[PDB]
Write a protein that binds this ligand. Structure first.
Ligand SMILES: CC(=O)N[C@@H]1[C@@H](O)[C@H](O[C@@H]2O[C@H](CO[C@]3(C(=O)O)C[C@H](O)[C@@H](NC(C)=O)[C@H]([C@H](O)[C@H](O)CO)O3)[C@H](O)[C@H](O)[C@H]2O)[C@@H](CO)O[C@H]1O
Ligand SMILES: CC(=O)N[C@@H]1[C@@H](O)[C@H](O[C@@H]2O[C@H](CO[C@]3(C(=O)O)C[C@H](O)[C@@H](NC(C)=O)[C@H]([C@H](O)[C@H](O)CO)O3)[C@H](O)[C@H](O)[C@H]2O)[C@@H](CO)O[C@H]1O
Ligand SMILES: CC(=O)N[C@@H]1[C@@H](O)[C@H](O[C@@H]2O[C@H](CO[C@]3(C(=O)O)C[C@H](O)[C@@H](NC(C)=O)[C@H]([C@H](O)[C@H](O)CO)O3)[C@H](O)[C@H](O)[C@H]2O)[C@@H](CO)O[C@H]1O
Lengths: 114, 114, 114, 114, 114
């Protein structure tokens, strides 16, 4: 598996606008909300859950990087895999998207799988 | 268990106003005090104890997130579970509330369960 | 044991004015020097030593917390246990106090045991 | 092996201009893009993969250092080992360069092997 | 062993002016360069290697503290042990000094062994 698999989805020119940390079924987790930097479109919500899903190994790296990009407010590309979380109240509050990568979008293009 | 269980309690539009770190019964712990962003009402005190309670797995994530939100002073929703800690002098000093989640808040909503 | 045990000592409204990191007898350690925000009294010195004393579990907290309060210069309550370190040259340079807790302060109180 | 081996390659006076975090084959990874501080030449891309290559042990140290230099915009020397990564879609997105060191640069000389 | 042993060497009123991270013989390492705050004298270079020397246990604490004092530019006392590293190309690039301690310095004194 790879962040850049064509079976994943991504959204460019986004800003991380909200951050939540909690625990579910023995696992610390976090969720982020992102919105287009220019104010268009619909928010993207994605979560990472420790020790859950194939993306578990990168939980700490993604939490650290989400915090970093949240603090700068810079434009980013957010990479997700859809339909991963199944806990129904959790999905309704947040989403079923697993967070699988984060890329800066400084220069003339976003720096990540395209 | 989940941060968002309705048997937990939460308080919206708060700011983390105080932070304490210590040790009890061989466990590092920390506590936070929050107040309404507008200054009204009564403070909320909540603690996390590293190897105690069902929320022990999230100790480091919550410590790191509390420190971040304390440093920015931004508005948050604090999620707690009541009546968890029972060390008598500890409860007098702080509270019996376990910290179980932290959500960033905009002017109109908070990014977390309600 | 507890940070708040009445057999420990504490000093309120102090500023962490100096910070030192080293190693002794296989253990990383750090020490801090604190002074009253108003300049009265005499400075307090306390150290935490990795894998040494009953307070060893909280070494990495405390170190991270001391660094933060050192960086802001804010007024804190420092909690110590006296007469813990016995290495004579070390005590002469620093002190025998073990650092056991750190609490932020407001204009009227500090957020910690007293 | 050593960062400074003459079988590695290095580029002086570069600014870290992009950062990406993801996962591949159960391993967190990150990539950076750097450009000459004066704008000349072509960008350097290098990645570190936490579970892969002889450089795996330094993954966290390099990620933390890359994040710091990215945040300051200071000029650095980037040390790489060429032709390490082999997944074609990964190499085409990023590069085959393994990141093996990062050095600050004085106004006249970079602080690392050359 | 102790940072403050008189068989170690120290240098007061220095500023950490350069920072390098790399890997050697499966071990992450870092090096710093320091110069007198007042611009006089000869620079001091010292390194820490995660898996090597009697000072290995303090690698992470010294890395974090070196990064902190590097970021603030404040004046420090650097404590080293001479003639530790032996790989000739490494020593020629950097030095044989092992980093064994870092102390903050006021105008009058430094908070560390002397
Ligand atoms: C690829 C596609 O579905 N539609 C094409 C447009 O995307 C494209 O117009 C450009 O769109 C750019 C944004 O492209 C992405 C992105 O954010 O990187 C590509 C993503 O694959 C896509 N993600 C998903 C799940 O579909 C994503 C998403 O649709 C939006 O982000 C949601 O708001 O868009 C960018 O905005 C360019 O400025 C814009 O020109 C063109 C190709 O040139 O044709 C469309 O069919
Ligand atoms: C064919 C050839 O060998 N050409 C070289 C010169 O073009 C070049 O000129 C000097 O370059 C200096 C910078 O030196 C490095 C550096 O960045 O530190 C040395 C690196 O080994 C090299 N990296 C490689 C080959 O992978 C790197 C790179 O080649 C470019 O210079 C940077 O994009 O340059 C410095 O800028 C001087 O001002 C300049 O005169 C040097 C560099 O090797 O010597 C010739 O070999
Ligand atoms: C040739 C010689 O050794 N001269 C000595 C003087 O440098 C010195 O004068 C005072 O030095 C003060 C700084 O003292 C230290 C320091 O940095 O804390 C003491 C250290 O032990 C020494 N470290 C060594 C030798 O490894 C260190 C070092 O020499 C300098 O930092 C290098 O620049 O100096 C301070 O600068 C005073 O302003 C000055 O009066 C004294 C004591 O060393 O007499 C001579 O021995």
């Amino acid at each position: 598996e790879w962040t850049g698999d064509n079976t994943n989805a991504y959204y460019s020119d986004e800003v991380i606008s909200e951050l939540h940390v909690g625990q579910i079924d023995t696992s610390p987790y976090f969720c982020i909300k992102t919105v287009k930097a220019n104010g268009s479109g619909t928010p993207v919500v994605a979560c990472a859950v420790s020790k859950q899903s194939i993306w578990a190994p990168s939980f700490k790296e993604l939490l650290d990087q989400a915090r970093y990009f949240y603090s700068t407010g810079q434009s980013v590309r957010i990479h997700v895999q859809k339909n991963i979380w199944t806990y129904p109240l959790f999905v309704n509050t947040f989403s079923a998207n697993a967070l699988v990568g984060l890329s800066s979008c400084s220069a003339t293009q976003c720096f990540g799988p395209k």
